[PDB]
Design an enzyme around this catalytic site. Structure first.
Site, PDB file in Angstrom:
ATOM      1  N   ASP A  63      38.776 -24.650 -96.303  1.00 22.65           N
ATOM      2  CA  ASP A  63      39.381 -24.942 -95.016  1.00 22.65           C
ATOM      3  C   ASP A  63      38.314 -25.675 -94.225  1.00 22.65           C
ATOM      4  O   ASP A  63      37.341 -25.066 -93.795  1.00 22.65           O
ATOM      5  CB  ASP A  63      39.804 -23.644 -94.330  1.00 22.65           C
ATOM      6  CG  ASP A  63      40.234 -23.836 -92.866  1.00 22.65           C
ATOM      7  OD1 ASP A  63      40.481 -24.974 -92.395  1.00 22.65           O
ATOM      8  OD2 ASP A  63      40.316 -22.805 -92.182  1.00 22.65           O
ATOM      9  N   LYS A 123      36.241 -33.846 -87.089  1.00 32.04           N
ATOM     10  CA  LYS A 123      37.589 -33.923 -87.645  1.00 32.04           C
ATOM     11  C   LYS A 123      38.537 -34.770 -86.771  1.00 32.04           C
ATOM     12  O   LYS A 123      39.434 -35.415 -87.302  1.00 32.04           O
ATOM     13  CB  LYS A 123      38.149 -32.507 -87.885  1.00 32.04           C
ATOM     14  CG  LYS A 123      39.477 -32.421 -88.616  1.00 32.04           C
ATOM     15  CD  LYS A 123      39.800 -30.974 -88.972  1.00 32.04           C
ATOM     16  CE  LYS A 123      41.155 -30.802 -89.622  1.00 32.04           C
ATOM     17  NZ  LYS A 123      41.356 -29.390 -90.033  1.00 32.04           N
ATOM     18  N   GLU A 145      47.563 -27.143 -94.190  1.00 26.07           N
ATOM     19  CA  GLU A 145      47.107 -25.842 -93.716  1.00 26.07           C
ATOM     20  C   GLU A 145      48.227 -24.776 -93.705  1.00 26.07           C
ATOM     21  O   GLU A 145      48.009 -23.685 -94.214  1.00 26.07           O
ATOM     22  CB  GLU A 145      46.365 -25.975 -92.362  1.00 26.07           C
ATOM     23  CG  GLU A 145      44.987 -26.641 -92.552  1.00 26.07           C
ATOM     24  CD  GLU A 145      44.398 -27.337 -91.330  1.00 26.07           C
ATOM     25  OE1 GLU A 145      44.859 -27.085 -90.202  1.00 26.07           O
ATOM     26  OE2 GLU A 145      43.433 -28.133 -91.502  1.00 26.07           O
ATOM     27  N   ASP A 168      49.639 -21.843 -85.574  1.00 23.24           N
ATOM     28  CA  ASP A 168      48.208 -22.019 -85.823  1.00 23.24           C
ATOM     29  C   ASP A 168      47.492 -22.411 -84.528  1.00 23.24           C
ATOM     30  O   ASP A 168      47.628 -23.549 -84.058  1.00 23.24           O
ATOM     31  CB  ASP A 168      48.007 -23.115 -86.883  1.00 23.24           C
ATOM     32  CG  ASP A 168      46.570 -23.210 -87.394  1.00 23.24           C
ATOM     33  OD1 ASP A 168      45.622 -22.707 -86.748  1.00 23.24           O
ATOM     34  OD2 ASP A 168      46.389 -23.807 -88.465  1.00 23.24           O
TER      35      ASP A 168
HETATM   36  N1  LIG Z   1      38.781 -11.839 -81.970  1.00 22.24           N
HETATM   37  C1  LIG Z   1      38.986 -13.050 -81.404  1.00 22.24           C
HETATM   38  N2  LIG Z   1      39.594 -13.168 -80.205  1.00 22.24           N
HETATM   39  C2  LIG Z   1      39.807 -14.355 -79.605  1.00 22.24           C
HETATM   40  N3  LIG Z   1      39.455 -15.526 -80.164  1.00 22.24           N
HETATM   41  C3  LIG Z   1      38.832 -15.550 -81.369  1.00 22.24           C
HETATM   42  C4  LIG Z   1      38.561 -14.296 -82.080  1.00 22.24           C
HETATM   43  N4  LIG Z   1      37.949 -14.626 -83.231  1.00 22.24           N
HETATM   44  C5  LIG Z   1      37.840 -15.971 -83.264  1.00 22.24           C
HETATM   45  N5  LIG Z   1      38.366 -16.514 -82.149  1.00 22.24           N
HETATM   46  C6  LIG Z   1      38.443 -17.943 -81.790  1.00 22.24           C
HETATM   47  O1  LIG Z   1      39.117 -18.707 -82.783  1.00 22.24           O
HETATM   48  C7  LIG Z   1      38.659 -20.056 -82.676  1.00 22.24           C
HETATM   49  C8  LIG Z   1      38.269 -20.572 -84.050  1.00 22.24           C
HETATM   50  O2  LIG Z   1      39.396 -20.472 -84.915  1.00 22.24           O
HETATM   51  P1  LIG Z   1      39.318 -20.997 -86.432  1.00 22.24           P
HETATM   52  O3  LIG Z   1      40.701 -20.835 -86.996  1.00 22.24           O
HETATM   53  O4  LIG Z   1      38.157 -20.336 -87.109  1.00 22.24           O
HETATM   54  O5  LIG Z   1      38.979 -22.548 -86.155  1.00 22.24           O
HETATM   55  P2  LIG Z   1      39.569 -23.824 -86.937  1.00 22.24           P
HETATM   56  O6  LIG Z   1      40.170 -23.382 -88.235  1.00 22.24           O
HETATM   57  O7  LIG Z   1      38.431 -24.821 -86.977  1.00 22.24           O
HETATM   58  N6  LIG Z   1      40.911 -24.476 -86.061  1.00 22.24           N
HETATM   59  P3  LIG Z   1      40.806 -25.962 -85.154  1.00 22.24           P
HETATM   60  O8  LIG Z   1      39.609 -25.858 -84.250  1.00 22.24           O
HETATM   61  O9  LIG Z   1      42.107 -25.969 -84.406  1.00 22.24           O
HETATM   62  O10 LIG Z   1      40.691 -27.005 -86.237  1.00 22.24           O
HETATM   63  C9  LIG Z   1      37.483 -20.056 -81.711  1.00 22.24           C
HETATM   64  O11 LIG Z   1      37.917 -20.524 -80.433  1.00 22.24           O
HETATM   65  C10 LIG Z   1      37.081 -18.604 -81.646  1.00 22.24           C
HETATM   66  O12 LIG Z   1      36.406 -18.259 -80.433  1.00 22.24           O
HETATM   67 MG   LIG Z   2      41.738 -22.707 -89.955  1.00 17.84          MG
END
Ligand SMILES: Nc1ncnc2c1ncn2[C@@H]1O[C@H](COP(=O)(O)OP(=O)(O)NP(=O)(O)O)[C@@H](O)[C@H]1O
Ligand SMILES: [Mg+2]
Length: 518
Positions: A8, A68, A150, A173
């Protein structure tokens, strides 16, 4: 050929998974973290990826965040070399450094070279964006076996392709940088995106930014308009405190933002010790949350279905851990419970790994059952399978039966354990064996040996044998849908033959255990 890892590659965080022993495992990075920030920085002509880059993303101006967003375009990002000259990097090159880092620690964790991957992309990604992502993989030395969406990866992680029926699945998502809701149609292994809607400038970062504004407003109130917006180190600390405070508010009703020595003025140190309640946080971030509601209704309408036709809802992305997010999604599909049982920041990588396992053709993915799928037996006189735990018994369980010896003056008993539904032990799967000796000389049928089959909550089998006269005992511990079906089929295919055999077998008298030298 070799293992195919699932990646991912997120805007904010990345995650790498692989099939091990027929289960997907999420691999930890060198800091012990199951996700890695999608950030690359440069200092002293050294490339810095992940957590160490995130810790200097405000203070080091060479840091590349959210690459990205530029994937599939001809934009370049500029960084300064150690000597003050400028280097231009493509989104492919920067993304490849993230992939190379994931690949490198994956290899060191697994202990093998990895040259193949399934990499995920958003459903809206066009060919330019998908090809950019594939090129990044190629630069990192990965044969990109497939690019998948995804939400498709999420659906694979939840086993939705195993439903044996058409499934309409809503995938909500909410990540760090982006929001997507996609409606999938899944039938006979085909995944079709019926509709996708979202916002690539709406994610958890924006919730953090509302907390930053809240802290900043408090600072200005308490210190005559003091404003740290141009102080890079202060802003680094505020961004980190804001994300931490948010995360705590998913599990707590309040949190304390603690920032000692944020700056020093003529009047002295500025120390922030500021409470933020969940209620206040939700009030501040309501406009952000509410931007995710209408797109749910929009994709349902685009897909030409009603809400009650949705079979499953999956929550994906770290931000779906927020209680207000879960409640909003629940409110939009009455009577359906959104699924977040798979860690939502790992689920996409898990799905990618599953796809990799499929493309490799390993076919090893095991089941986790709370009821025994097949009968468990001990071999008795004449190669007969005497059942101890019948099929479809709920685990954990222990069952006991007392046996004797098959021949006069028998010194030991063989305990041969088999699995399957057929009446002769040789026609079932051998699970293992052991011997219990020291039996005192006596006629056949006289010695008494208690046999115990025990299955724990994890489904591990312990077989114990105790000579009730001598008190001596020995035991062993014993270490797949298709194989279960093969065994059931073998019994079904020989039903008539086996009935004739069973008509010669009487299990109601005390069973006897043979000994044969090996
Ligand atoms: N327990 C939690 N409560 C609230 N927010 C959280 C928690 N855990 C992670 N996050 C948030 O989730 C986000 C990251 O999500 P994640 O799915 O790991 O990113 P990603 O896959 O790169 N998605 P994107 O940024 O849209 O491409 C960040 O803003 C974190 O602060
Ligand atoms: Mg993700």
């Amino acid at each position: 050929n070799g293992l195919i890892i699932g990646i991912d590659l997120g805007t904010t965080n990345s995650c790498v998974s692989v099939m091990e022993g027929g289960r997907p495992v999420v691999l930890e990075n060198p800091e012990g973290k199951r996700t890695t920030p999608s950030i690359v920085s440069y200092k002293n002509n050294e490339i810095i990826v992940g957590d160490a880059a995130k810790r200097q993303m405000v203070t080091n101006p060479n840091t590349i965040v959210s690459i990205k967003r530029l994937m599939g375009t001809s934009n370049k990002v500029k960084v300064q070399n150690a000597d003050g000259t400028t280097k231009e990097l493509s989104p492919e090159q920067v993304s490849a450094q993230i992939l190379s880092y994931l690949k490198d620690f994956a290899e060191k964790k697994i202990g093998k070279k990895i040259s193949r991957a399934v990499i995920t992309v958003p459903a809206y990604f066009n060919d330019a964006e998908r090809n950019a992502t594939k090129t990044a993989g190629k630069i990192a030395g990965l044969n990109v076996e497939r690019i998948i969406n995804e939400p498709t990866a999420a659906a694979l992680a939840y086993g939705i392709d195993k439903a044996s029926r058409e499934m309409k699945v809503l995938v909500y998502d909410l990540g760090g940088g982006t929001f997507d809701v996609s409606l999938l149609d899944i039938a006979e292994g085909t995944f079709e995106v019926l509709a996708t809607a979202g916002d690539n400038r709406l994610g958890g970062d924006d919730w953090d930014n509302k907390i930053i504004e809240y802290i900043s407003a408090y600072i200005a109130k308490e210190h005559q308009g003091l404003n740290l917006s141009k102080d890079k180190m202060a802003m680094q600390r505020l961004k980190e405190a804001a994300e931490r405070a948010k995360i705590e508010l998913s599990a707590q009703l309040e949190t304390i933002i603690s920032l000692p020595f944020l700056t020093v003025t003529q009047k002295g140190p500025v120390n922030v010790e500021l409470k933020l309640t969940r209620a206040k946080f939700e009030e501040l971030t309501k406009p952000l949350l509410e931007r995710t509601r209408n797109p749910i209704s929009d994709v349902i309408k685009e897909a030409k279905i009603k809400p009650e036709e949705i079979n499953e809802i999956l929550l994906v992305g770290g931000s779906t851990r927020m209680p207000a997010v879960q409640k909003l999604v629940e409110s939009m599909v009455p009577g359906k419970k959104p699924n977040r049982s798979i860690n939502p920041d790992e689920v996409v990588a898990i799905g990618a790994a599953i796809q990799g396992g499929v493309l490799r053709g390993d076919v090893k993915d095991v089941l986790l059952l709370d009821v025994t799928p097949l009968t468990l037996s001990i071999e008795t006189l004449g190669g007969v399978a005497t059942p101890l735990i019948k099929r479809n018994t709920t685990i954990p369980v222990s069952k006991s039966q007392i046996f004797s010896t098959a021949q006069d003056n028998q010194e030991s008993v063989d305990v041969v354990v088999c699995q399957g539904e057929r009446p002769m032990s040789r026609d079932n799967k051998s699970l293992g064996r052991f011997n219990l000796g020291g039996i005192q000389p006596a006629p056949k049928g006289k010695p008494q040996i208690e046999i115990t089959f025990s299955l724990d909550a994890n489904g591990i089998l312990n077989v114990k044998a105790k000579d009730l006269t001598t008190q001596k005992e020995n035991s062993i511990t014993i270490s797949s849908e298709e194989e279960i079906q093969k065994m059931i089929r073998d019994a079904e295919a020989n039903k008539e033959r086996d009935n004739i055999i069973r008509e010669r077998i009487e299990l109601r008298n005390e069973g006897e255990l043979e000994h044969h030298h090996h």
